[PDB]
């Protein structure tokens, strides 16, 4: 029983290692995209505020 449990858990742990690395780069890409989008929003809002200021002036 212990040997069978060892084999099953080893297979599950190989699958879990693969899934965990996969989720690793998935979350890395997701947060990088989030940061880039936030930077783009910063730039866009700054540009819009400057446009409004110059138009009013």
């Amino acid at each position: 029983a212990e040997r069978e449990a060892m084999l099953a858990k080893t297979a599950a742990d190989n699958r879990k290692s693969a899934e965990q690395v996969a989720a690793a780069q998935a979350d890395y890409e997701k947060e990088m995209a989030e940061a880039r989008a936030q930077a783009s929003a910063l730039r866009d809002e700054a540009r819009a505020a400057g446009r409004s200021v110059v138009d009013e002036k």
């Binding site: 890395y28 990088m32 730039r43 110059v54």
Partner: protein, 49 residues
């Protein structure tokens, strides 16, 4: 599995560091854009004068 968990932690740390760095760079870019836009607005105003 242990190495994968350690790499997950290390990649997450580097990811948050990169996110903070790019956020700071974007803040600097926005500051520069706002400054140059204000300067251009002043130039336009004096040209109208």
């Amino acid at each position: 599995l242990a190495d994968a968990d350690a790499m997950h932690a290390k990649a997450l740390a580097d990811a948050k560091a990169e996110s903070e760095k790019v956020t700071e760079e974007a803040k600097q870019d926005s500051e520069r854009i706002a400054a140059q836009l204000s300067e251009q607005a002043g130039s336009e105003a004096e040209r109208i004068k």
